[PDB]
Design an enzyme around this catalytic site. Structure first.
Site, short mmCIF file in Angstrom:
data_model
loop_
_atom_site.label_atom_id
_atom_site.label_comp_id
_atom_site.label_asym_id
_atom_site.label_seq_id
_atom_site.Cartn_x
_atom_site.Cartn_y
_atom_site.Cartn_z
N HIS A 131 -9.38 -50.94 29.24
CA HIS A 131 -9.68 -50.45 27.88
C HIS A 131 -8.91 -51.18 26.81
O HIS A 131 -9.23 -50.99 25.64
CB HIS A 131 -9.37 -48.94 27.84
CG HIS A 131 -10.35 -48.07 27.07
ND1 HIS A 131 -11.69 -48.28 26.95
CD2 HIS A 131 -10.10 -46.86 26.52
CE1 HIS A 131 -12.22 -47.26 26.28
NE2 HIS A 131 -11.28 -46.36 26.09
N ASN A 157 -9.16 -43.26 20.84
CA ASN A 157 -10.10 -42.33 20.23
C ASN A 157 -9.81 -42.06 18.78
O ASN A 157 -10.64 -41.35 18.16
CB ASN A 157 -10.27 -41.08 21.00
CG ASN A 157 -9.16 -40.18 20.97
OD1 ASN A 157 -8.12 -40.44 20.50
ND2 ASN A 157 -9.31 -39.16 21.79
N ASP A 201 -13.82 -53.59 25.22
CA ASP A 201 -14.33 -53.48 26.56
C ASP A 201 -15.72 -52.89 26.56
O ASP A 201 -16.00 -51.91 25.82
CB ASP A 201 -13.42 -52.62 27.44
CG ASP A 201 -13.07 -51.28 26.87
OD1 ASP A 201 -12.61 -51.20 25.72
OD2 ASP A 201 -13.23 -50.25 27.62
N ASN A 218 -15.21 -44.73 23.21
CA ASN A 218 -14.60 -43.74 22.35
C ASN A 218 -13.82 -44.29 21.14
O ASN A 218 -13.52 -43.61 20.22
CB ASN A 218 -13.76 -42.71 23.18
CG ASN A 218 -12.41 -43.32 23.92
OD1 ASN A 218 -11.43 -42.54 24.41
ND2 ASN A 218 -12.39 -44.57 24.15
#
Length: 196
Positions: free
Chosen positions: A25, A73, A98, A119
């Site tokens: 991520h 997020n 990603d 997210n």
């Protein structure tokens, strides 16, 4: 402010901290940190915009780099005020991230579209809209929707890491096109990458 689709803000998405630095991520962080080293752009603490940022010349263009330090997020809490403050339109923004829907070693430049479940992107598109450019760095998809957290927060095996690192390296070589506004050509030459 920004000017047309000459890219002048390059964002890399990721999570802060050593425990996340090697995880899938953070692909966008990998790209932007490598880009900053290639061009000699300092990435320094930017508490005002909840991130680490830099500014410098890429191929004769003044470009800003941004790594949100908000956690993934909450990435819009960095990207949105930063781009507003500097008067950077979405059309001049490249966000590296990603991409679960592509294999390690596949990379694509995309303009527009939704978050695809990401997210970080989910926190950005509501505010600035979708018309920014994305460097989608394939990371593969795990077994199920249950498995997504464990996959994105995992450290890829060496083969997958090598595939991603190659694709990232290719993309670095195409940033010159982007900062010059040659989005079509960059799109063709990035998307044609193969690892072998």
């Amino acid at each position: 402010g920004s000017h047309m689709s000459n890219i002048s803000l390059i964002v890399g998405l990721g999570n802060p901290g050593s425990e996340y630095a090697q995880t899938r991520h953070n692909a966008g962080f990998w790209f932007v940190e490598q880009l900053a080293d290639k061009y000699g752009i300092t990435l320094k603490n930017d508490p005002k915009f909840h991130g680490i940022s830099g500014r410098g010349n890429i191929e004769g263009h003044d470009v800003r780099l941004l790594l949100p330090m908000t956690y993934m997020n909450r990435s819009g809490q960095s990207v949105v005020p930063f781009s507003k403050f500097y008067q950077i339109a979405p059309e001049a923004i490249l966000i590296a991230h990603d991409e679960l829907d592509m294999n390690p070693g596949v990379i694509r430049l995309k303009t527009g579209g939704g978050h695809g479940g990401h997210n970080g992107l989910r926190d950005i598109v509501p505010h600035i809209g979708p018309n920014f450019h994305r460097l989608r760095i394939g990371i593969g998809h795990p077994g199920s929707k249950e498995r997504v957290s464990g996959h994105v927060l995992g450290k890829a095996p060496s083969n997958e890491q090598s595939l991603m690192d190659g694709a990232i390296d290719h993309a670095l070589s195409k940033v010159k096109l982007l900062v010059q506004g040659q989005v079509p050509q960059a799109m063709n030459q990035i998307n044609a990458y193969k690892p072998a």
